[PDB]
Amino acid sequence: MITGIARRLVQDGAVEEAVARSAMDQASAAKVPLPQWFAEKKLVTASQLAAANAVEFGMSLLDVSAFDASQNAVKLVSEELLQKHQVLPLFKRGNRLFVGVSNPTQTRALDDIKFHTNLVVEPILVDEDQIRRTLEQWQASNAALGS
Amino acid sequence: RQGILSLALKDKPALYSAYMPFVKGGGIFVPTPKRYMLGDEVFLLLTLPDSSERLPVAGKVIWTTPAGAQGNRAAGIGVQFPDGPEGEAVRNKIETLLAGLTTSDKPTHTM
């Protein structure tokens, strides 16, 4: 029976019932979390998977195309970490750094940033497409400042 | 209220928690248990602390936090102010009221 984000993707109309079952059974056989499997296999669009992830995982979701690039916090995360992981550092508030992730089940990436920054790291969902494009966009805007 | 949200902000702390300074054009967080999708067009009636005027904001959803979210984070939607004189006016009043408070360390409804 169809549970988790697989069920939510059905209720959202993003995927067929039998495809959701087959994905779910496959992920279970691989011992891989459902959102990771769905992203890897591209069963639905990134924004659809982000939408189902947000409601089922209880997480906030940001359209970063409306974020003011000039307020990004990319420079708090080293170039190495930004290629090791596929995350989009967003914005700092006090001892908190909000980090865009597209997989609700990142741990290494958030913990690495936690150790590198000595900040408290809060994940915010951002769909996988936007993280790819926007990180590059924001690196270009940061570079225009110099260095 | 058939697709018309409303938000009344009675003091400066309420406005601080609601305001979204990193949104292009400005944005405002509106508590609601209804699930919205990023990109949805919404109409908001926004009351600010300085007066009883209800400000019409025809904006786009750029942020969602779901019902039963992980922590003490309120369910609702972040609404981008539209391009145009009506939107910039709203942003301008807000940024005056919160002067020196936006780079505060105090947590908001969003970030």
Residue numbers in the entry:
A (entry chain A): 11 to 157
B (entry chain C): 7 to 117
From the reporting publication:
Type IV pili (T4P) are thin and flexible filaments found on the surface of a wide range of Gram-negative bacteria that undergo cycles of extension and retraction and participate in a variety of important functions related to lifestyle, defense and pathogenesis. T4P filaments are produced by the polymerization of pilin subunits in a process that depends on PilB, a hexameric ATPase associated with the bacterial inner membrane, while pilus retraction is powered by another hexameric ATPase, PilT. In Xanthomonas citri, two cytosolic proteins, PilZ and the c-di-GMP receptor FimX, are involved in the regulation of T4P biogenesis through interactions with PilB.
